[PDB]
Structures are given as structure tokens and as C-alpha cells.
């Protein structure tokens, strides 16, 4: 007596993300051997974390030049991964595919100016509890911020803490929300000595606690 399969109806249809592996249609083939091939990266997140990438700025240039006028805030950008400032960054590009992201995002600021020019820069993260960014270096002092003088070590890295009501935050801000989903982040040059026409390069990389999940497919 043949076993009765009693196959179900309405399920078992082929799925693009289905875990099931298709039956082999060819004989076993041994491919050319590759052992310890250089540059292999097991996880996409590790590559973003291992190597930092630049942030888009005025006229497609990454470094924020010291304002000619007396402005203490060089640039202010939304904390959300889908932000114009981070539009060209590699970390946002991998993050765009993932539905939502969690964990701290590291920002690396490295001074690229002559030895005679010395300037002091402050990076302050503002939580989304106000209609607008800290207006000035003093007003923004109350929120989490780091002030670093430019010395022998050109690059200072400040990790943006991830704090939100929801455990996970959407990578791309929806059109319906007229305000940033998460908090803006502002870079302020509190004091500059002979820094006219001096550029500071700012970059963003995945944090140690940073993680992405629920991969989906947004059009790029």
C-alpha cells in the first residue's frame, strides 16, 4: 500500500526568498581552488564598519570649509541614514536596502589644514525633542557633544549614540513625517585661529553596536 501524502492546497508555491534549495540538474563539478583569497568580506556591515566613507556637502565636496562669515555651525544634518549629507556615503548605501537600522553610527572628523592653522571643532548630537537643531555651540552644549582641539592627531572620531522610543528606527524617513524621524547632528567650529579657507574632512562608519536587519528591496 503506497503511503498517502495528503498534499496541502494553497501552500508550497515557489518564493523568491524561500529557504528551500532547488534539485541539482548537473553532476558534481570541482571548481578551481581558492584558499585565503585576499579582501574577502563575510559581512557587509563589517566592511562599512572597517572602512569609513565621506559625507556629501555643498557642491559635492566632503570637507566642511570654515565659514568666511562669523558662523559657528559648519553644517547640520538629519541623524536618519537616508539624509542628503549621507546620500553619497557607502554606509547609507548598504543601509538603504535594509528596512530599519539600530546601534550607534560613528562619525570620524579629520582636520586637513596647514600646521600654522589651529582650530577647535565641536560635534553635538541633538535628540528629536525640538522643532529645530541647537541654534548655536553654547545652546547645543546641553545635548551630548564632544569638543576636540586640532593637534598631532588629525582625526578625532565621535560615535553618535542611538537613542529612540522604538528599539529599531526606519533607515529611510517617510514623506508623511515633516520632521526628522530621529535627531539632527550638528558640527560646530567654536574657535578657529588663522583657519580662513581651511577644510576639515568628516566621514561616517558603522558603529560596533550598529546592526541592520529585515533586508528589503528599495529602488536606488
Amino acid at each position: 500500500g503506497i503511503v498517502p501524502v495528503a498534499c496541502s492546497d494553497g501552500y508550497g508555491g515557489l518564493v523568491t526568498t524561500d529557504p528551500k534549495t532547488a534539485d541539482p540538474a548537473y553532476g558534481m563539478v570541482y571548481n578551481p581552488p581558492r584558499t585565503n583569497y585576499p579582501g574577502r568580506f563575510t559581512n557587509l556591515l563589517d566592511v562599512a564598519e572597517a572602512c569609513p566613507t565621506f559625507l556629501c556637502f555643498d557642491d559635492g565636496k566632503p570637507y566642511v570649509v570654515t565659514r568666511a562669515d562669523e558662523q559657528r555651525l559648519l553644517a547640520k544634518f538629519d541623524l536618519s541614514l537616508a539624509a542628503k549629507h549621507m546620500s553619497n556615503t557607502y554606509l547609507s548605501g548598504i543601509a538603504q536596502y535594509y528596512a530599519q537600522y539600530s546601534g550607534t553610527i560613528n562619525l570620524h572628523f579629520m582636520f586637513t589644514g596647514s600646521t600654522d592653522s589651529k582650530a577647535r571643532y565641536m560635534v553635538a548630537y541633538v535628540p528629536p525633542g525640538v522643532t529645530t537643531p541647537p541654534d548655536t555651540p553654547e545652546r547645543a552644549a546641553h545635548c551630548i557633544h564632544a569638543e576636540w582641539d586640532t593637534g598631532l592627531n588629525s582625526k578625532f572620531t565621535f560615535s553618535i549614540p542611538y537613542v529612540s522610543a522604538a528599539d529599531y528606527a526606519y533607515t529611510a524617513s517617510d514623506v508623511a513625517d515633516t520632521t526628522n524621524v530621529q535627531g539632527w547632528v550638528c558640527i560646530y567650529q567654536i574657535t578657529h585661529g588663522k583657519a580662513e579657507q581651511d577644510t576639515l574632512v568628516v566621514s561616517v562608519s558603522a558603529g560596533k553596536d550598529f546592526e541592520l536587519r529585515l533586508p528589503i528591496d528599495p529602488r536606488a
Partner: antibody
Amino acid sequence: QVQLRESGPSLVKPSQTLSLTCTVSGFSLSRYQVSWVRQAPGKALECLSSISAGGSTGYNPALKSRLSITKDNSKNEVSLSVSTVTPEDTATYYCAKYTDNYDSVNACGFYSGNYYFDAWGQGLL
Amino acid sequence: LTQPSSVSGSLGQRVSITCSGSSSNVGRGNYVNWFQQIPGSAPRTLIYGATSRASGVPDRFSGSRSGNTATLTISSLQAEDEADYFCATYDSSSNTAVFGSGTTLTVL
């Protein structure tokens, strides 16, 4: 819809302070920088003053300390008062809202080149 | 700044207005803002950042800036296009936004 309206005296006696008020409707006055631009008759515009979201109250350097600008978020009104008004400085006054907040402040808007004035309003002489 | 007092372009013909200042007023890195003002009405911003059009502005308007010269070119000219055009940029040496003398575009 975005609407800016200017309310103030058209004729003022010289050697007196001119006070103007910009009545804003359509957008929250705390999320957009407002800039006061004055133009001289048949002459090129001259940016006069501006106030950012949090009330930076930046003033044009050439006429700095000759005028004071105060903006109240609750009443949705931006007020610009010019002291020592003179016959030579006679032109239409335009109050506009910058897309960005505190984009420049020392210069009343358009210093970055990323955000531009969205609504210039009816204007007032 | 220094720009032509008036430029005349026929309907359906591209018209180019050139705004020229100084290295300090307009840097190669820096950009200028183009404002179109109808007589008897408040000024309207057509080009912001010197290469883009503000929301609610038609795609025909084009802005190109080379060196110290910023040029606004209008294609498919229409009756509404006739207006006074002002180019606005921020001069680092002056430390105050500097506006152009004014260019009036007339359609024949």
C-alpha cells in the same frame, strides 16, 4: 499655502525709528528663517536683516545697530524696527522665509547656496 | 554686481543674462542665486545654488556660472517671463549678501 504679509507705515517722518511687522501664515514661524530685504526705488535689492528659527536676529553689517528685529513664534509675527529713518533710505521692504533655519544669519539668507527664499510676500513701502 | 541693464529675446528663442562680480563676491567653489521680479510685485527666486530650480518653477530656466561670471539662460520664452532679474551672491570680503544692479528681459 505659504503666505507672508507686511504691515507698517508707508510714510514716516525722518529722524524717527521705523517699526515693521511681518504677519506669517501657512508655515510655523519657528521652523523657517525669515529675512527682511529692502529694495531702493528702481535700484538693486539690499538684504537688510534676518532672524533664524531660534531667534539669531542677525543684522546686515553696513546698517548694523541702526535696526533691531524681534520675532514671536506664538503670534506668528516677525517684527523689524529701523531707527534713524532717513529720506535717502526709501524703498519697498520685503519679508521672506528661508527654507533652512539659521542658514547664514550674519547675511540674511542665501550664503550657503543650498536653501533659497521660498515666499517673498506682497511687500510694503 | 555688474550685469547688462536690459536683454531682449523673442518668444520661443533662448535668452542668456550674464552676472559678473569679483573673485571675493563669487568664488569658483561658491554659487549665486537668481531672482526674477515682476514690476509691482515681490521678487521670486528662480535659481538657488546656481545650478538648481526652486519648487514651483518651470524647468526651462537654466543657470550656468563659470569663474566670476554667473549666467541665467531662459529657453522657450513666454509672455510671463518678461520681468526684472536680480542675481544675489554673498561677498566674503564685504561679509554681506550683494545683489546685482538689475537686468530687465523684454520679449519682442
